[PDB]
Amino acid sequence: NYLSQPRLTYKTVSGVNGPLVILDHVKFPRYAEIVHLTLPDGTKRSGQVLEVSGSKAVVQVFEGTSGIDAKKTSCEFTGDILRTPVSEDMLGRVFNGSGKPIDRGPVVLAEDFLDIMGQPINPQCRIYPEEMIQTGISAIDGMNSIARGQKIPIFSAAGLPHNEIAAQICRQAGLVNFAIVFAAMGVNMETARFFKSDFEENGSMDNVCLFLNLANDPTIERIITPRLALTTAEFLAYQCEKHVLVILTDMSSYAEALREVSAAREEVPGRRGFPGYMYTDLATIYERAGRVEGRNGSITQIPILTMPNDDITHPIPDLTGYITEGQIYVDRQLHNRQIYPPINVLPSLSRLMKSAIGEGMTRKDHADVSNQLYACYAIGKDVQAMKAVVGEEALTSDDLLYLEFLQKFEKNFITQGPYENRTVYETLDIGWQLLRIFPKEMLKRIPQSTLSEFYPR
Amino acid sequence: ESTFGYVHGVSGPVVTACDMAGAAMYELVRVGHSELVGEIIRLEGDMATIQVYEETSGVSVGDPVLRTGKPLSVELGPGIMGAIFDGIQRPLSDISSQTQSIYIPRGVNVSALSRDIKWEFIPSKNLRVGSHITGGDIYGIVNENSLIKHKIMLPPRSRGSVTYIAPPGNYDASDVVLELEFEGVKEKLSMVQVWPVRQVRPVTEKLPANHPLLTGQRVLDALFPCVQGGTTAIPGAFGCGKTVISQSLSKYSNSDVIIYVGCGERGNEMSEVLRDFPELTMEVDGKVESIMKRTALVANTSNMPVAAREASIYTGITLSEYFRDMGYHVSMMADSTSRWAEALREISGRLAEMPADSGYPAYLGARLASFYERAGRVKCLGNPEREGSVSIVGAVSPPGGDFSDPVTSATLGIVQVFWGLDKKLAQRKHFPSVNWLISYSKYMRALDEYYDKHFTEFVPLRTKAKEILQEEEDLAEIVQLVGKASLAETDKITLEVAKLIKDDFLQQNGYTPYDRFCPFYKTVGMLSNMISFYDMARRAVETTAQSDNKITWSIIREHMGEILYKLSSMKFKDPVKDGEAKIKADYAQLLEDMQNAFRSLE
Amino acid sequence: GGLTSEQYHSQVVGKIGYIARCMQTIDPENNLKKIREDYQDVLIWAEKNYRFEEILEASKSGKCPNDLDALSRRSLILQELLRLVSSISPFKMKLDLIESQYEKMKQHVNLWKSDYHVKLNQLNQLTDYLKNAAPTPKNN
Numbered sequence A: 001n002y003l004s005q006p007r008l009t010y011k012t013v014s015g016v017n018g019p020l021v022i023l024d025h026v027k028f029p030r031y032a033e034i035v036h037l038t039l040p041d042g043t044k045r046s047g048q049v050l051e052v053s054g055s056k057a058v059v060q061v062f063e064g065t066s067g068i069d070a071k072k073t074s075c076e077f078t079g080d081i082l083r084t085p086v087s088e089d090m091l092g093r094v095f096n097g098s099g100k101p102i103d104r105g106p107v108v109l110a111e112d113f114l115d116i117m118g119q120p121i122n123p124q125c126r127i128y129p130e131e132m133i134q135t136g137i138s139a140i141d142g143m144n145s146i147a148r149g150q151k152i153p154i155f156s157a158a159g160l161p162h163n164e165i166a167a168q169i170c171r172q173a174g175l176v177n178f179a180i181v182f183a184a185m186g187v188n189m190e191t192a193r194f195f196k197s198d199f200e201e202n203g204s205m206d207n208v209c210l211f212l213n214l215a216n217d218p219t220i221e222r223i224i225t226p227r228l229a230l231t232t233a234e235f236l237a238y239q240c241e242k243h244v245l246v247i248l249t250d251m252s253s254y255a256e257a258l259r260e261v262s263a264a265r266e267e268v269p270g271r272r273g274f275p276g277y278m279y280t281d282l283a284t285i286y287e288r289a290g291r292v293e294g295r296n297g298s299i300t301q302i303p304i305l306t307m308p309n310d311d312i313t314h315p316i317p318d319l320t321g322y323i324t325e326g327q328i329y330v331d332r333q334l335h336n337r338q339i340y341p342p343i344n345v346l347p348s349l350s351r352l353m354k355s356a357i358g359e360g361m362t363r364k365d366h367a368d369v370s371n372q373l374y375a376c377y378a379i380g381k382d383v384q385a386m387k388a389v390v391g392e393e394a395l396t397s398d399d400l401l402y403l404e405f406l407q408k409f410e411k412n413f414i415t416q417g418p419y420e421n422r423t424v425y426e427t428l429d430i431g432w433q434l435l436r437i438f439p440k441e442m443l444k445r446i447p448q449s450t451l452s453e454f455y456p457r
Numbered sequence B: 001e002s003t004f005g006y007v008h009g010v011s012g013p014v015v016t017a018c019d020m021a022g023a024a025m026y027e028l029v030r031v032g033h034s035e036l037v038g039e040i041i042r043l044e045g046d047m048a049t050i051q052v053y054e055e056t057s058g059v060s061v062g063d064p065v066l067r068t069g070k071p072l073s074v075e076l077g078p079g080i081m082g083a084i085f086d087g088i089q090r091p092l093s094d095i096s097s098q099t100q101s102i103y104i105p106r107g108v109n110v111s112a113l114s115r116d117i118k119w120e121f122i123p124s125k126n127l128r129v130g131s132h133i134t135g136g137d138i139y140g141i142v143n144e145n146s147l148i149k150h151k152i153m154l155p156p157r158s159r160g161s162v163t164y165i166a167p168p169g170n171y172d173a174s175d176v177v178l179e180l181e182f183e184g185v186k187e188k189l190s191m192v193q194v195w196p197v198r199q200v201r202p203v204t205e206k207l208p209a210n211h212p213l214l215t216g217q218r219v220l221d222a223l224f225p226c227v228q229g230g231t232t233a234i235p236g237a238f239g240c241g242k243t244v245i246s247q248s249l250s251k252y253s254n255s256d257v258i259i260y261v262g263c264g265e266r267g268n269e270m271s272e273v274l275r276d277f278p279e280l281t282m283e284v285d286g287k288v289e290s291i292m293k294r295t296a297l298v299a300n301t302s303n304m305p306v307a308a309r310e311a312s313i314y315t316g317i318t319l320s321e322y323f324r325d326m327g328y329h330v331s332m333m334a335d336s337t338s339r340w341a342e343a344l345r346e347i348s349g350r351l352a353e354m355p356a357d358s359g360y361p362a363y364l365g366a367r368l369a370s371f372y373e374r375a376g377r378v379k380c381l382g383n384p385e386r387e388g389s390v391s392i393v394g395a396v397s398p399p400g401g402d403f404s405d406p407v408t409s410a411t412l413g414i415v416q417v418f419w420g421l422d423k424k425l426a427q428r429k430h431f432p433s434v435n436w437l438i439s440y441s442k443y444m445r446a447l448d449e450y451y452d453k454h455f456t457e458f459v460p461l462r463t464k465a466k467e468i469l470q471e472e473e474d475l476a477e478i479v480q481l482v483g484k485a486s487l488a489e490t491d492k493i494t495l496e497v498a499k500l501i502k503d504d505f506l507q508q509n510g511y512t513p514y515d516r517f518c519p520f521y522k523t524v525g526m527l528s529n530m531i532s533f534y535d536m537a538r539r540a541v542e543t544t545a546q547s548d549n550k551i552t553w554s555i556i557r558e559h560m561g562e563i564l565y566k567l568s569s570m571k572f573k574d575p576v577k578d579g580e581a582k583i584k585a586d587y588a589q590l591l592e593d594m595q596n597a598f599r600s601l602e
Numbered sequence C: 001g002g003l004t005s006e007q008y009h010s011q012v013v014g015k016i017g018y019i020a021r022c023m024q025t026i027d028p029e030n031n032l033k034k035i036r037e038d039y040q041d042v043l044i045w046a047e048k049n050y051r052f053e054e055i056l057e058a059s060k061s062g063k064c065p066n067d068l069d070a071l072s073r074r075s076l077i078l079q080e081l082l083r084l085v086s087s088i089s090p091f092k093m094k095l096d097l098i099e100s101q102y103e104k105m106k107q108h109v110n111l112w113k114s115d116y117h118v119k120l121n122q123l124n125q126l127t128d129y130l131k132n133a134a135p136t137p138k139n140n
């Protein structure tokens, strides 16, 4: 039933501190209910109740507390949590951080209201994602393959072409209808236009929804921006059977809003001063993915994050690492050499590749090829590190073949055009024509049956 | 007195409640009109602070808070096996059935066991009216599964004399199966007992551990063995393989039942288990059967409410102790004690308590200590004698991938086995990624009697394996400053057999049909051949380097390249296609081929 | 890119009233018939003595034209014609040339990128420098 009871409105602001405003005399505060604030000048803001205690409600104000006042500020308590109007009508539209429209279209008519927090998908109803998506990118489809409904982030150093990679996935991704949710947090306008323009250049724009929060929009709205995106993705996938892909852009600029809120609340700090709940907060984003029984929908997530000081062990990538189905890494050591897309296969993995490949999904050889490509690429890096100290005169002929493998591999397997789509089969054949650099017996990861069917060609 | 107080305040997973005079600390309490489940963490006057095992978003000041007297407790009985439960014991299959939802609703109260199922009960026949009986006495079997006979037993707090025992027949969780009397007071029981998860289920004795916890992985079972009744940790960074070890133990081990505990884990893990385990099969007595019949999952996915991670771990061990009391060699996969410690960080943060290292509460080391030490091999309670055991394996997940982590630092002080995973091996896709330099097992001195009885050749091989694998790293620190030309022939042989033992013994692709599992006979056969090559190659050099007719590693490789290729090929032997005698005969032919080749070099 | 709804509609009214002032300025007599007709939809709301509130309500209601991109392009076209006429004040050009130049601007892709605007900026710099120039060879 609808909430029929008339809304209260309080002037009883009794403190303000950082992004918090503390009400008093509140009649039965509800934890996590939303409050609208009117400032003395008639400006409207919104905020969530973070704590309640007897008559007190601690409200965090999304649009910042600057201009909140202890006498004239009016808080309309809405009486419920942060619901969002959702509809399939949100495809082909663009929204601000808090889900207000910015494409000059009207306010969304709700086909329903959903709780922004979503719900924990029941582990019994969840279906283990296995139907492969070809992204078209050899460094993915060959060695890091993505299942329909996987969650797998793209990690990057700063300034790397990770935007162009995500754009290419949103230009080439498909199975062996489809729709995209896109969200960006703390993005610069010089990149917001790139994403919006790319969905026009790909012709895709009619099947995609962009939630944009820019670096000069309010930082606390970034907390809800990816949650709005996921709530829309749940409506499209689980209510409407759409094969949804969710792009979350700079989870780092989201994580910085967590660190800010944490410091402002005085929460117990984990590594680098992120809140203790950092893992759970990231899970509350990243777990809304994968198929569920009876529903043909399948939320896939490709978060993107700039790793601070390029450090893989930083809390943002590292906690994301524990949650996601493996990770795709983009590297300066490739990008400086103009090797687009600069995806370094070696540190990458996909947890679901194990079941997304082989007969009925991909050619029989694929799993064996992937492992042997890791083996040779890795040994190539090891002999390169040897050559950099002791010179090529210390290397055996086989060690020089592993060095040549790494060179030929990066120039052919990883190197691909920004608009070039390669099938998995073409990627595997490039894999084999590189593996043929060694004698058949040297391919120690591959069984003799696979070698007899696929090595000689 | 009032049965309920009222929510005085809320902050994330913490709810304060007024009018709670006479509450007990760690009492289980319902919160809110929707009847959320929680537990009292602190008392502060006529007022209480409750950790809530569901998300509190939506709770209001002045909502009812209903006491229950009972501490956090689990229903134990028939119909546990094959099920999946959340951290507060709700059976997910029945939630799915009753709600038809994709998600677990807030406020669900579904009974922990399916009280509608008539189970087949077989009373012990030894009991009769007037007989004396005590906690842990098996009053009857229930034929729960084709594998696991459930052995119902008197609750450990209970004692008395048999007033009534039910005849052989079909009964459920509400049917009275037994009635006692003690001190003139009668006590009825159904087939379901209830136990406080924070209280250890007692035993007659905790014995030493002395039978290997057989595991599919070569490197584990050979070089760092776990033992039935022993603890273990698998500290590893993200993507290191610790979860696949945890799967592999559950899929393939000599454990009579497995409790798997998905504490704060990624949701697709539970789906993968529930996808794979009904389809994978063991065999008993000439009947092939689905391994799910010997498991239960406690799940609490990473996005489920933080507090329930604590209740999940305590549920997983309390179930494990229940099956231990039946005499089963239980195993229990504590699938991340760091994500558990992070839940203790959360409650401590809300309570405003003083943190130890990295925000963790000071009692973290004490909670972990009093958890892993619930393992053991035990003389059970009660009269028919049983030797059950719990073996606990904890997938610690160090923040930043660094073992200076406080969860690791505490865990290593408690566990008798360390399987430290290396991210650099996982990057190379070397798996399982066990670092053989830092890993250790304290059980070797007890297990050496079992190896002496069944595998007398093994202790020499295990020693030579560990030594070669250390000598590799001793050589590497030299080679990286001068180049490989500095090596003596003994050192080249050392690095080569280390490369065999690394790439063809320690390496194991556990999803493939051939690396799926590895029997001990296959494992020792592989290692025996590799070390036989080491000793023979070393002997050949030592025999001939006293002369100008000196054998070298290159001479051996050029004469014996096929033998190196055969040695590498040993891993591909498949237990489904090849019998133990067939694999052993192939390995004997490798020993003979090596001997005849070396006899031609010398 | 965007604004608060109050700001956005207040900018729309600003464009409408400005286009009307420019139309009155370039043509106090209704001689530029085809130009005037091509703005009748905006001009009516400002040639009528409507209150600012009434036109703001009509903008919120979608009764006034309200696309700021279209209004800005249309406003720019009129002002870059007005700028021409004003910049040649001592040499008032033919009406047929004005409506011809207007048609060329109406057809143009982007007036800010156009050499038309560049020529007028150069004319403006030269013209504006004279306004306070003292008697001097260069200035003469």
Ligand SMILES: Nc1ncnc2c1ncn2[C@@H]1O[C@H](COP(=O)(O)OP(=O)(O)O)[C@@H](O)[C@H]1O
Pocket (backbone or CB within 6 Å): A321, A322, A349, A350, A351, A352, A354, B236, B237, B238, B239, B240, B241, B242, B243, B244, B245, B431, B432, B433, B508, B509, B510, B511
């Ligand atoms: N034993 C293994 N055999 C083959 N591949 C493995 C093995 N261990 C790790 N890998 C691959 O790496 C992935 C990451 O390891 P996993 O245990 O699943 O993640 P995590 O370390 O975070 O818990 C595995 O799911 C699998 O795809």
